């Protein structure tokens, strides 16, 4: 039980980060390896890394 929503949209400038918009759900699997955490979109099914300051516990 640790889902987080994006409070703001974001456009990954690379192919590693992910891209979404305010209101996108995300499942964080690891966030203790840098200010960026690895989240997986439960709508697209793709996983990547996004700004931890852009997500919060829904």
């Amino acid at each position: 039980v640790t889902l987080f929503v994006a409070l703001y949209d974001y456009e990954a400038r690379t192919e590693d980060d992910l891209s979404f918009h305010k209101g996108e759900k995300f499942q964080i699997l690891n966030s203790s390896e840098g200010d960026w955490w690895e989240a997986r979109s439960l709508t697209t099914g793709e996983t990547g890394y996004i700004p931890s300051n852009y997500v919060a516990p829904v």
């Binding site: 409070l7 703001y8 974001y10 400038r13 690379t14 980060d17 840098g34 200010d35 960026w36 700004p51 300051n53 852009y54």
Partner: peptide, 14 residues
Amino acid sequence: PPRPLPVAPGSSKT
């Protein structure tokens, strides 16, 4: 290291 941590809109960064 410097991360891509984008600036949060709304309150932005002053």
